């Protein structure tokens, strides 16, 4: 027969899983945590939640579950379901949903010296407040806060697992099996034990283990689907200055159509940005900038059309403006002759009116050239600055600014 | 620990968890209730639901769970599963669609004097009367009502732990500001009988919305469209683009209606502030389009069919142009040949007369455009200020 | 009562609900499987899932639950909680989620003869493949496969349920008029039931309930087809607009915008399967291509209208086709000072004559444009009418068969 | 605490079996009186036709086994027992959507010394009620909550409406109970009627679970403000803008642009409206009828603008202005519509040629002007014929919508108000 | 059955289900694991999650559960609740967001020799690397890794039932075609110790997308818009609608970009094929608009302020039109009266000269349009073929 049966029936007989295994008064149970990251499933900006698949390793000593191997044919390791044993109530505190516990309650590995090794896998959804300032050229700093929801610092002592005498102060990632998220890349992954000094060694919240994930976005999707089309469409507003300023030129058509396309892009971006209202995202800043510039260019096109279509009758072209712009910048015979003279006079007058119209058109063209140069410079500088601020938004070199250590294996 | 194992075995040997912890059935258990707000997960204006992550701190004394520490190796406190002992059934009276009572049966702390401390976590989804009159500059006041479901005040009495909820460890929302918070205890009696009070504790949190997301995402585009609305009046009618421009502004606003519909709450209790503003913008654009159509019709009036009324000439050609200071607008075969030349000359007479009349019509249209540009810029500014500044000054 | 307590204690002293009730080793338990449809909630086509609210009318015999009513004050039947008796693990096998079992465990009815009856309620999400070819003018054939998850044909024998006064089997889904809500988007045409075996596996047997349902396409008719018809009318009308108006491109390209907007509207409603193209999408693509060709021909007509001798020379074939032949078919059918002054007048006359000839050639080009535009008007009208009528009759001839074949 | 002894006597010493009905003889019927209290109406999202509500189910029955003499113990006049220890009547919402038949929170029961047991568990219920879209958004819905006892047949337990007393006479509570103080009105819906009924089905049999029923009805009216503000008024104004196309001169090449843009805006409004309603096909919604009518009318306006432009641009070189057309569109309709030495020989020949050319050009121009006048007449006629149709159709449609109040008395054949103010007798 | 009742009573009296079913603790339990794929529920490209409906067949011997048929009326097989006996803890190692282990504890088939057959159902939501490079013509290789969580290979050994997953009762997907499927067993050792193998079984399925839905609903409208943007160059400048057509095509493409973002996955690992084609179409339309503006500017070139450069005339008026074979393009008061007539004649001369220069500019613009029409039709065809032909040929 299986000796494990006799051994386990002996161990669990007269065993109370409600009772912390503190050997005596003032004995503190050491619980060591080691987090392994299997998959970074996603980071939902709308919900401000990070979903991860982790294997959390919890180790402690339970003196009641020790045995002498010589009495059980050298058995030194048994598996007992975790629901039969006392467990330290290590839970994820900063969970968005009400899921504090692990997902699968694996068996606990129990060694003959009382050492207990529990490796339950878990799917966790933790709160990650989103820094939207540089979205989509942003990096986030998410944390997983672990603490015991039952016992305080007088009863348990949360520590980071130590391997071969060196503290494992980082999230463990197996190089081969780990798969890149596809939207996020992990730059730093430190772990440290934290204290809430506002509390005393009671309250169960005094101590905690925090695992940090400093992740950088890969903005290829946004660049290809929103940024580049938006920039190309918005740059079209500088073309209005080369269209003729009369009916059929279609200055207003082009400018207002570009503005309408930018409105469509505003609707498109409204569905991606997080709803928090502490900062304006970089992409939103750029859309506002281009919309304002397009409004200005529509105004300038309207002004140019008004200037170019002026007539001697509605407006008078004062010589000051001309200098300013075109500078620094038988009775039958009697009746027949009367008719001929009147014809010549009318033709002369019409030609003169035409000439004045052409003067106004030239003034309009000069204004077009000047405003084109101004608008090209403005648009180029604004776009370059806005999308160069994001390119220089780099993750800090160190996981903790003032800490020299790199926190890597 | 063998001492603690023996203690726990002895405490629950003859313990009935359905009986109240009172020495005599006429007494009442006194429970100190405290609420610890940890996070404001979300507010749903359409469904009037406020979701919060809280801890419900409950303290009371169970006389049946005493022991002498000297008999148990000096043990003074233990942790017990909450399912092992009598618990008070505190229920969120104004629950919307969450859980009515505590579902996370966490462990509780028990002193050797019977004093019990229990702080289970919970997610409260409460019914929140939302007021959208001043959206997005709106302040919301809504509560969490708590009480013992099945016991009256003569069996189980609940008293608040402090004067207000504990927000010591409250995560900052990023969308709301906790202006104030407090908790009040109420005694409710019924016509039955005045000897059976019914107690509850209401915690209310006054929240102020942070109006930046909605500002930049809704109000600013509305301002651009409003500003462009009156721009059409400076555009001359000769360029066949007055209707193009105004109608494109209207289409842009109609497309933006999608953004508003998907962003602002869909309640029907009252009209939001931005709802009034956007309706104003719509009517503004439509009026501009109507008057632009009128002006275009006026500009193209032909002398042959329409003759200028005297009052139109008197007003728009003589009076108003004088009082427009900003504008720079001004204020054998020989007999056949001879007969043909005369005919040409008289035809030019007629052409010049018709051209002059059409020019007068065009001038009147231009004057109307200038007046309308002034009026519409003024109306835009006045309407925006009237809609917004009234609420903005109060802040 | 006290006697009910005594009877229950006697019945369940050594009763084991884990053991299937068989008088003798080798006996089979006959289980009658019936279904009552209370409400056909949804037929989500995005996930190919039908949600229904049903009752399972199960009946079998348990020899262990037998008693003499004379000895128990004439107690003829008991209502025993369903978990206290053996029950067959009748489940929905073709469920889309992982929910095989019932939701509400109503207690069983046990009669003194050993006849057990159980009518649990459930909200089932079954998976039925959607034939997306005539959508939204389509009928679907969604099934619900019921069998014992554990026991096979060597242990239980599935049968059809009996009617209220059990005399003959009921081979259909039962619908209780007192409690039944019409879907409002689906009409139930047939609802048969049948037992199915498998030739390869002799231990398999199930009872399948088939729902043949026809969609009511009013919503889609209005919200997609009517606007498409109006847009097609505009696309035809573009060819009646004179080229001088400068509005052909506005009309045609705005029609194209409208069609793509309707495609955006329809995106979130058509099932995303790749076995076929739904008829509505085919109609949208036909209208889209028709509008695109209207745009192309409008561009061609505008190009023809704005030609002049200064740029183009009119070839013989264009003249013959568009001026001689087509019009009748389309019903169009159209002293130093004195010498200086004399020279000036002569020059003016020559200029007028040259302008007259130039204008005549331009008018020939514009007439060619007019004739081509009329021809395109007629051709597009005919094509649009024929195509729309063909597609709509094809859609309207799609009806579920008279015989369900099940 | 005497309660411990009393409860031990009731449940353990007497051998209480919670799986057995509380009847002394197995032929009597247990009467369960139940009532419903509506804590708040959460939602009636019409897309999937689900009514979410927070309700408190009130239960009451007698249990002769849970009786005691209050004097034999201390004067204990009431007990609180968990429902897992006593017999409980399983009354389930039959017409639920999500698969939740039971109450949310199994609270304690209350027991008096005479065996009277009251149970008041709260619940969140998601019932299915079909949506009548006929007058959307001026519609009122009639949603129902149907409760059945599926654990016992009618011969074993009888469901009844709870009763109350005012002045010594008890009456049934035939309505949903609403606490005027605690209840907060829904953002979108107003409750008009709230009857309660016990339904028997005589075509079934008492020895079945489909024979009895207790139904609570909620006749609620939508508050049409969100839709009036955001959907109807802008659409109505943009549609009225289509009539201005006729007042816009043909010289301004923007008639077609205006009409087509109006049609595009109406298509956007159709897209917006399509998402707000279920896919049912019982009827076309009122807003849908209006959108279809107005879109058809605007398409007609576009066609008529196209015809007018085709008329305006005809010339003598391509069209003939017949006498019939001239009389109709220049005399009759404008009146009805109240509308407003060889060198000298060569010189002489050249001037004669110039004169002839000018005369021909003048005739061409005047006939072009005649075509322009014909186009203007067609515009005026079209406006006079279409603007009144648009205005009258809109007014008629929306006053029909605004005249759709609920019947003011549920159960058409019933003269009873089912109002909490006037209980029967 | 009284025989089976007695058998079950005697078969679990002293059965501890926490203990492994081995006669001696140095032996191992040999479990035959087989996977049966019933249905491919969905493939989530954004989160890289594949949802499958499977049956996880498991077979092993439990010597403690054997009996002699002759003592129980010849019973040879019974059904037991799976929660009554020891079960192997098979876990889906690459679970994304589903259950890690079996949760539906269905009954198992127990043979009189101790042989056990357990086939519980499951929904596996497994993480798998999605490669969107040839989307929608993409082939995916997604796996299911299974293994015993808490036992090594010396205590519990799993071996595949067969070398392939069972797809006998597979449901045809309608979106994916199952190219291939196989299962492999791996031995994994650690630097600890080479005597303790850790076993896992990996099942992988090669899936080919059926690219009809995406073709029709995305690619065809893009082709149509590309064709129209190419067409813009045949529209004469005199009809003032070139900008209307080109910018309306751009607006249609923007609305369709909205549609695409609604439909196509939002991955970011690499640019899909549709992404490259959409970007190419956008750049195509933008270049078309720019060159259209250039042509319009050239057409309305004032001869008064500009004079045609000699090279422009040489190229566009002399040589280029000759090589365009398919085209049809061309290859007292009497003194005052006399002076007035002379003035009319000389003004006509000047107007004729100006008109000739303007007509030359228009001719140059028209020639440029012909050249660009050919060029842009060629580019449209070439790019459309280039983006897709490689993948289409690979298939
Ligand atoms: C364990 O048991 C063996 C007998 O099998 C004994 O010799 C040995 O001393 C025991 N170990 C200890 C630490 O006492």
Numbering used by the authors:
A (entry chain E): 1 to 329, 410 to 489
B (entry chain A), E (entry chain D): 1 to 331, 370 to 433
C (entry chain C): 1 to 334, 398 to 469
D (entry chain B): 2 to 341, 416 to 500
What do the authors of the reporting publication say about this deposited model?
Nicotinic acetylcholine receptors on muscle fibers are inhibited by many general anesthetics and are the principal targets of neuromuscular blockers used in surgery. The receptor assembles as a pentamer from four homologous subunits arranged α-γ–α–δ–β pseudo-symmetrically around the channel axis. The transmembrane domain (TMD) of four α-helices per subunit forms a pore lined by the M2 helices.
Further focused classification revealed two distinct states of the receptor, one with rocuronium bound in the pore and one without. Both structures contained clear density for rocuronium in both classical neurotransmitter sites, with loop C propped open by the ligand and the ECD in an expanded conformation characteristic of antagonist-bound and apo Cys-loop receptors. Rocuronium primarily makes contacts with the principal (αδ and αγ) subunits in both states. In the conformation with rocuronium bound only in the neurotransmitter binding sites, the receptor adopts an overall conformation like the apo resting state. Together, this first rocuronium complex shows how the non-depolarizing blocker prevents channel activation by competing with agonist, inhibits the conformational transition to an activated state, and stabilizes the pore in a resting-like nonconducting state.
